Amino acid sequence: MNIFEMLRIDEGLRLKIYKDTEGYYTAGIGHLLTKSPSLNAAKSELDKAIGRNTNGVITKDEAEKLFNQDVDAAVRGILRNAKLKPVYDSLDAVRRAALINMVFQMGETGVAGFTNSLRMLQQKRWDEAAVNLAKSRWYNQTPNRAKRVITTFRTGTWDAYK
Numbered sequence: 001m002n003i004f005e006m007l008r009i010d011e012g013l014r015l016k017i018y019k020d021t022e023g024y025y026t027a028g029i030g031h032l033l034t035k036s037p038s039l040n041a042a043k044s045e046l047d048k049a050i051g052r053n054t055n056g057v058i059t060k061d062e063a064e065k066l067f068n069q070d071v072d073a074a075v076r077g078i079l080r081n082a083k084l085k086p087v088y089d090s091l092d093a094v095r096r097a098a099l100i101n102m103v104f105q106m107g108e109t110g111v112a113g114f115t116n117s118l119r120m121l122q123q124k125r126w127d128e129a130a131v132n133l134a135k136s137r138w139y140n141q142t143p144n145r146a147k148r149v150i151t152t153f154r155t156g157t158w159d160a161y162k
């Protein structure tokens with residue numbers, strides 16, 4: 001298991017524009033297109049991301065390419081974030097993947113806002129962090145996914161994904 005396989009399980013793969021859990025236009029492997037209600041605006045962003053007239057439909061290769069870019073961007077985002085970087089550097093490889101998953105889902109800003117949980121993670125207080133992470137809108141809105149990521153931080157193993 002690795003970050004790619006993990007995210008692929010959490011996000012799924014859809015070759016057409018779809019609406020995410022929050023009702024936002026997305027395509028491929030969790031690639032958010034726009035928060036705007038306009039399908040046209042979404043099609044426009046998709047075309048601009050892929051570099052062709054897609055008509056809202058992409059190929060598997062195209063989806064994977066957006067995916068690789070997005071994973072890369074999440075990692076680079078964490079390393080440039082003063083609040084995230086120290087946490088990330090303190091963690092082991094498995095837990096690092098868990099932090100990347102959160103950033104991919106909710107953005108750097110969103111995750112950086114989990115002040116208390118971040119501090120607990122940095123301190124290696126696993127059970128405590130897991131409890132604190134669960135007191136959030138994130139957990140209440142996407143509980144199965146949140147549980148998988150939380151277990152990952154709690155145990156440092158991939159058990160939740162096997």
Ligand SMILES: [Cl-]
Nearest residue numbers: 048049066069
């Ligand atoms: Cl893009």
Ligand SMILES: [Cl-]
Nearest residue numbers: 142143144145
């Ligand atoms: Cl869920």
